Amino acid sequence: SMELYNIKYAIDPTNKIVIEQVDNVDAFVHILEPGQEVFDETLSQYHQFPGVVSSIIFPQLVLNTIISVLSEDGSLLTLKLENTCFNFHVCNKRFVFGNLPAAVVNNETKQKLRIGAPIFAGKKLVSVVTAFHRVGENEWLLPVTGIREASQLSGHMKVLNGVRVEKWRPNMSVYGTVQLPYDKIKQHALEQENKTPNALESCVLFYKDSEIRITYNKGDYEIMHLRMPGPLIQ
Amino acid sequence: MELYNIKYAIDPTNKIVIEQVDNVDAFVHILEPGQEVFDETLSQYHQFPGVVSSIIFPQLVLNTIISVLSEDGSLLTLKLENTCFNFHVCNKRFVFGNLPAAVVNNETKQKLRIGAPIFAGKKLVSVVTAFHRVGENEWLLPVTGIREASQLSGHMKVLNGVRVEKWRPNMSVYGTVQLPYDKIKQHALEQENNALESCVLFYKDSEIRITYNKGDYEIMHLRMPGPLI
Ligand SMILES: Nc1nc(=O)c2ncn([C@@H]3O[C@H](CO)[C@@H](O)[C@H]3OP(=O)(O)OC[C@H]3O[C@@H](n4cnc5c(N)ncnc54)[C@H](O)[C@@H]3OP(=O)(O)O)c2[nH]1
Numbered sequence: 001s002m003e004l005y006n007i008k009y010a011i012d013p014t015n016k017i018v019i020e021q022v023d024n025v026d027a028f029v030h031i032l033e034p035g036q037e038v039f040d041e042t043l044s045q046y047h048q049f050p051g052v053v054s055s056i057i058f059p060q061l062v063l064n065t066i067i068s069v070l071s072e073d074g075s076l077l078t079l080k081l082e083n084t085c086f087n088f089h090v091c092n093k094r095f096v097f098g099n100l101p102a103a104v105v106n107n108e109t110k111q112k113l114r115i116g117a118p119i120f121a122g123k124k125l126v127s128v129v130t131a132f133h134r135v136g137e138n139e140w141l142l143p144v145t146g147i148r149e150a151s152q153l154s155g156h157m158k159v160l161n162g163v164r165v166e167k168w169r170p171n172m173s174v175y176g177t178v179q180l181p182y183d184k185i186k187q188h189a190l191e192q193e194n195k196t197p198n199a200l201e202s203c204v205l206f207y208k209d210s211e212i213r214i215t216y217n218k219g220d221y222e223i224m225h226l227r228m229p230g231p232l233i234q
Numbered sequence: 235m236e237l238y239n240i241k242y243a244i245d246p247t248n249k250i251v252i253e254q255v256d257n258v259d260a261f262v263h264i265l266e267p268g269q270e271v272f273d274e275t276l277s278q279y280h281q282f283p284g285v286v287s288s289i290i291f292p293q294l295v296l297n298t299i300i301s302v303l304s305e306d307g308s309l310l311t312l313k314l315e316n317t318c319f320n321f322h323v324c325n326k327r328f329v330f331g332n333l334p335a336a337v338v339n340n341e342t343k344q345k346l347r348i349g350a351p352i353f354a355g356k357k358l359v360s361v362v363t364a365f366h367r368v369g370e371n372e373w374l375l376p377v378t379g380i381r382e383a384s385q386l387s388g389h390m391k392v393l394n395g396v397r398v399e400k401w402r403p404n405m406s407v408y409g410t411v412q413l414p415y416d417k418i419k420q421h422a423l424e425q426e427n428n429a430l431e432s433c434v435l436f437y438k439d440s441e442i443r444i445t446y447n448k449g450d451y452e453i454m455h456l457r458m459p460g461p462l463i
């Protein structure tokens with residue numbers, strides 16, 4: 001396999017980078033698609049950050065520092081972590097999510113990047129390419145997943161029935177499983193008790209370009225409501 | 235008294251009472267950091283960390299300038315350059331978030347009453363709710379309101395309050411416990427769901443963690459910036 005800085009890597013039949021070793025120690029780095037749900041009990045022993053199951057810790061970065069990514073041309077591309085991006089997956093009924101530091105690339109640059117391309121800070125691996133989010137014409141967001149950046153948020157929650165993602169419509173407030181006008185949500189919230197017959201647990205993610213809402217519910221009763229920056233990677 | 239678009243008074247506890255905003259009768263009730271209250275009359279109003287309010291405290295932008303009413307009636311101009319985490323519990327509802335904050339010294343903090351109206355563009359946008367000591371002569375002043383675009387807010391129903399715990403140096407967090415990573419990892423893979431619901435907030439100077447649990451089983455784990463007030 002090929003060696004670069006402190007890693008060894010290979011390439012998938014799906015044109016995806018496979019991280020084989022880091023610091024001369026055998027490694028496991030498994031990339032998940034945005035919002036993908038998988039079930040595989042073998043994955044729970046490893047670390048998880050949004051979009052990756054990894055045997056190696058992807059360490060905390062700082063916004064506005066410079067990282068390097070391996071390009072399809074064997075070169076290193078230097079990028080500044082100027083934006084943020086929200087990504088998630090579901091692995092063994094655990095919703096793993098967070099807002100990640102992100103770089104910005106044009107159409108030409110994105111296509112030179114493989115899903116899995118190692119990302120370096122200094123000459124040490126700090127992350128891998130996991131996803132691309134289109135932020136308009138000739139512009140993409142490149143999240144750098146890993147341990148929560150100091151100013152950001154990360155987390156997980158057990159979701160028995162997955163994560164149902166819903167487009168967040170204009171003029172709607174959010175309670176539990178519904179988005180409705182505020183005056184209605186205010187009446188509904190003060191109305192709801194934890195008494196839904198045959199109440200199943202739910203997790204809902206509502207999204208607009210700027211903001212994400214996550215609720216955790218038992219039946220129609222809202223247990224948690226979290227508001228956080230966007231955007232979401234489809 | 236009047237100032238800009240508000241009318242205000244003073245409490246027996248030296249706390250500012252907002253009486254009307256835009257000539258409409260107002261209700262602004264300031265809660266202490268982490269305070270738990272129960273009063274069914276509060277649930278009809280808006281709630282942002284540290285305040286129950288009949289008026290919306292709108293979204294602000296970090297690094298913009300706000301003005302605060304001083305004890306002497308003058309306006310002090312401050313820049314929203316920092317953040318800090320605050321919360322309360324009202325009617326078994328944990329209301330929390332990271333708020334934009336200014337930095338003040340001892341002399342300035344002492345000129346500020348809890349409840350002091352905060353203005354942006356000659357309009358009320360918030361009230362003084364809390365002070366968090368940074369150092370000897372340094373304080374953080376949260377400006378509560380609708381979540382700033384880059385930060386987080388939320389709520390959750392907590393039947394048994396919020397347990398606040400100091401977060402120890404080398405400990406990872408699962409559910410109700412903080413333990414070394416190797417045990418937390420095994421414990422997490424151990425859990426499966428007379429189990430009571432729980433909410434725990436572990437705090438460090440830089441970072442805060444909230445867990446929501448059913449007995450010993452962790453349902454949710456949130457990591458977010460600190461500090462806590
Ligand atoms: N993944 C991750 N994202 C972050 O943003 C982050 N910020 C700090 N840290 C800490 O750095 C070390 C990372 O290894 C840990 O000390 C971790 O502290 P913690 O975040 O306090 O510990 C909870 C552990 O416990 C893990 N688990 C929790 N529940 C489960 C579960 N059901 N199944 C499998 N693992 C579970 C949980 O994912 C996790 O461990 P992992 O790193 O292995 O992911 C982070 N970790």
Ligand SMILES: Nc1nc(=O)c2ncn([C@@H]3O[C@H](CO)[C@@H](O)[C@H]3OP(=O)(O)OC[C@H]3O[C@@H](n4cnc5c(N)ncnc54)[C@H](O)[C@@H]3OP(=O)(O)O)c2[nH]1
Nearest residue numbers: 173174182185186189190277279280281282379380381387
């Ligand atoms: N409080 C608050 N903090 C923020 O950071 C924020 N960012 C946007 N918004 C929206 O701005 C308008 C402000 O009113 C609302 O449209 C709100 O949309 P939403 O945040 O999507 O709606 C859920 C409603 O519903 C309220 N409820 C939810 N549960 C309860 C409950 N048990 N009892 C009483 N009220 C409950 C919940 O507090 C809430 O209403 P409040 O405005 O009063 O805060 C925010 N609101």
